Amino acid sequence: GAMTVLFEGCDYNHWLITMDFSKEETPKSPEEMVAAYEETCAQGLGISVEEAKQRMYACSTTTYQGFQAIMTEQESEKFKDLPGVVFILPDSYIDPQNKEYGGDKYENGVITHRP
Amino acid sequence: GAMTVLFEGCDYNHWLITMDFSKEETPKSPEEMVAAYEETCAQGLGISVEEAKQRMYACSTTTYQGFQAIMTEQESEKFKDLPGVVFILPDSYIDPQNKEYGGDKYENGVITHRP
Amino acid sequence: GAMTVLFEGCDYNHWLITMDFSKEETPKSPEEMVAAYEETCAQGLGISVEEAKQRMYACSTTTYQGFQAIMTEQESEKFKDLPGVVFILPDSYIDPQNKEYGGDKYENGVITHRP
Amino acid sequence: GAMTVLFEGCDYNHWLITMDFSKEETPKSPEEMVAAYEETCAQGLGISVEEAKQRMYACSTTTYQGFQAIMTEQESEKFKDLPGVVFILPDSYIDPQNKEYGGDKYENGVITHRP
């Protein structure tokens, strides 16, 4: 109808994607793991690798093995079909008070390790 | 991937649909509003009125004017195009401890006023 | 842990609250219904009617009988034991692409009948 | 009021909790990581180990390093303060048609590997 209010659930725009490197014949190096995050981000979002790098803002190869990127919830669903993907999940603050996500910083294709 | 775990959020299978009867020139009676709930539920789900009456579990013509039925989110979306529909919303327990929804109980057309 | 990522579900900051006036002796005028919305909003937020008027942004006395205000989930929860409150639900757009909520527009007590 | 229906978002009772074993000079064996899952579960739920093992239904030391257990959202929030916890999130089906969670099956200390 003209007055219809259809419920619209809230959504998420920060997403964490983990990957499975445990079955590799030869274990990937940390930089090889990050290269694979970049390629998977581009494959899932369907953009250039340079474009995918500007969407990513953090990743880890230690505490966990995954990356974090700005994307819509609809975009996050595109990763369900990809090889090696484990968790697709909204990112949440490790420091809610300071509004900081966890992992190492990833900015402009450059990794900054964080303790 | 084979072990992908996609977070989609949880699903709702109980839906409240409220109706606007404020614009018709002839004000409807209680049983006339309930008859309109049944026909709206049938039209929106694409099923017979006899079947829609089995899906419905509560309604009101006093506290509110609307009805509640078991359906999926994909099904409830289709009510957005029907005349007179106001709110389409996941239903919630009036009495969470006893897992009770609000409104009058509706049992295949037999209606019991909630104390 | 210092690297714990606790899931933070998404939330809602626009809330629709409907009212039951069916039981009352003499049916309320539209202006009386709107005054009831302001008193209820003030009580649920724990503030004055003057302050609550600034939080409201829409209401209806026809299509539905309720008001809409900006508030958090924790604030919306405080309406649950107020007299005559029926539904407490997140507000959603009647026109999603244009980001417009439904009902009549409400700005500090001045209502604009939305055609 | 007696008719108030407060929008209850849907609640989660299946939770995934991952762990950080990356700091240890000598990495933990699979059996040591599983034993650490049981100890974390008991400590986070505030229950005995035997009671905690009853709540657990799946885990991994390979694809990911974590366990999944029945618990309320209020209970999972308590793991945010335990050492070595990384993710706390609601579990989701790897196969939505069969309603099966991922990871190896855990039944009270018995692990059945599932590919």
Q: Would you say residue A2 lies in a domain?
A: no
CB C68 within 8 A of CB C56: yes
* Both structure tokens of B32: 């006339």
Dihedral angle, C-alpha B101, B102, B107, B111, nearest 10 °: 170
Q: How many domains does chain A have?
A: 1
| Alpha carbons D76 and B49: distance in angstroms, whole number | 44
Q: Of the candidates C54, C58, C53, which has an alpha carbon nearest to the alpha carbon of residue C94?
A: C58
Quick one: residue C103, left, alpha or beta (phi over 0 = left, psi -120 to 50 = alpha)? Answer: left
* Both structure tokens of D96: 């939505």
Question: What's at D45, amino acid-wise?
Answer: L
DSSP labels, chain C: -TT-EE------SEEEEEE--TTSSSPPPHHHHHHHHHHHHHHHHTS-HHHHHHHEEEEESSSSSEEEEE--HHHHGGGTTSTTEEEEEE--EEETTTTEE-SEEEETTEEE---
Quick one: residue C84, left, alpha or beta (phi over 0 = left, psi -120 to 50 = alpha)? Answer: left
Q: Would you say residue A1 lies in a domain?
A: no
Which residues does chain B have within 8 Å of residue D18's beta carbon, measured at their own beta carbons?
none
For residues D44-70, one letter each, b for 16 or more C-beta atoms within 10 angstroms of the residue's C-beta and e for the rest, the string is bbeeeeeebbebbbbbbbebbbbbbbe
Residue D86, Cα to own-chain centre: how many angstroms? 11
Q: Would you say residue B6 lies in a domain?
A: no
Find tokens 């969470």 and name the residue.
Answer: B96
How many CA within 13 A on the CB side of residue B21? 19
Beta-carbon neighbour count of residue B80 at 10 Å? 14
CB D19 within 8 A of CB C3: no
CB-based contacts of C43, cutoff 8 Å, min separation 6: C82
Largest CA distance in chain B: 59
DSSP at D10: -
CB D21 within 8 A of CB D35: no
Quick one: residue A104, left, alpha or beta (phi over 0 = left, psi -120 to 50 = alpha)? Answer: beta
| Alpha carbons B62 and B84: distance in angstroms, whole number | 17
CB-based contacts of D58, cutoff 8 Å, min separation 6: D67, D68, D91, D101, D102, D103, D104, D105, D106
Q: Of the candidates D3, D5, D39, D4, which has an alpha carbon nearest to the alpha carbon of residue D19?
A: D39
* Both structure tokens of C93: 């757009």
| Alpha carbons A1 and B83: distance in angstroms, whole number | 4
- Strand (E) positions, B1-115? 5-6, 14-19, 56-60, 66-70, 85-90, 93-95, 100-101, 104-107, 110-112
Which residues does chain D have within 8 Å of residue B94's beta carbon, measured at their own beta carbons?
3-5
CB D15 within 8 A of CB D25: no
Tell me the residue range of the domain where B48 lies.
14-112
Alpha helices in B18-112 (DSSP H): 30-45, 49-55, 73-77
* Both structure tokens of D86: 């990384």
Q: Of the candidates D38, D33, D90, D35, which has an alpha carbon nearest to the alpha carbon of residue D64?
A: D33
Q: Of the candidates C91, C21, C100, which has an alpha carbon nearest to the alpha carbon of residue A2?
A: C100
Q: Determine the residue of chain B that is closest to D4 in CA distance.
A: B94
User: What is the CATH number for A73?
Assistant: 3.30.70
Name the resolution in angstroms. 1.9
| Alpha carbons D43 and A91: distance in angstroms, whole number | 25
Q: Which C residues 47-66 touch A at CB under 8 Å? A: 63
DSSP at D81: G
Tell me the β-bridge partners of A14. Answer: A70
* Both structure tokens of D28: 């933990």
| Alpha carbons C79 and C95: distance in angstroms, whole number | 27
| Alpha carbons A87 and A114: distance in angstroms, whole number | 22
Tell me the β-bridge partners of D66. Answer: D18, D60
| Alpha carbons C38 and C82: distance in angstroms, whole number | 13
Which approach determined this entry? X-ray
H or E, element range at A107: strand A104-107
Q: Is the dihedral of CA C111, C68, B16, A76 positive or negative?
A: positive
Q: Cα(first)–Cα(last) distance of chain D, in Å?
A: 52
Q: Would you say residue A7 lies in a domain?
A: no
Taking the CA of residue C37 and the nearest CA in chain B, the distance in Å comes to 16
| Alpha carbons A17 and A43: distance in angstroms, whole number | 13
Q: Would you say residue C9 lies in a domain?
A: no
Q: Would you say residue D68 lies in a domain?
A: yes
Q: Would you say residue A8 lies in a domain?
A: no
| Alpha carbons C74 and C78: distance in angstroms, whole number | 7
In angstroms, the Cα distances linking D34 to A20, A38, D48, D95 are 19, 31, 16, 24
How many CA within 13 A on the CB side of residue A53? 11
* Both structure tokens of D74: 């209020």
H or E, element range at D39: helix D30-45
| Alpha carbons B114 and D2: distance in angstroms, whole number | 10
Residue A103, Cα to own-chain centre: how many angstroms? 11
| Alpha carbons B17 and B67: distance in angstroms, whole number | 5
Picking from B1, B7, B85, the nearest residue to A89 by CB comes out as B7
In angstroms, the Cα distances linking B35 to B39, B41, B78, D3 are 6, 10, 20, 23
The neighbours of chain D, by the rule of 3 or more Cβ pairs under 8 Å, are: A, B, C
| Alpha carbons A38 and A110: distance in angstroms, whole number | 11
Mutate to test the interface with B, among C14, C33, C77, C87 (most CBs of B within 10 A): C87
Picking from C16, C18, C63, the nearest residue to B64 by CB comes out as C18
* Both structure tokens of B55: 């899906």
Q: Cα(first)–Cα(last) distance of chain B, in Å?
A: 52
Please tell me the total number of residues recorded for chain C in this structure.
115
Quick one: residue B105, left, alpha or beta (phi over 0 = left, psi -120 to 50 = alpha)? Answer: beta
| Alpha carbons C56 and B63: distance in angstroms, whole number | 23
CB C38 within 8 A of CB C48: no
In angstroms, the Cα distances linking C86 to A2, A5, A63, B88, D46 are 23, 17, 47, 15, 38
Q: Would you say residue D74 lies in a domain?
A: yes
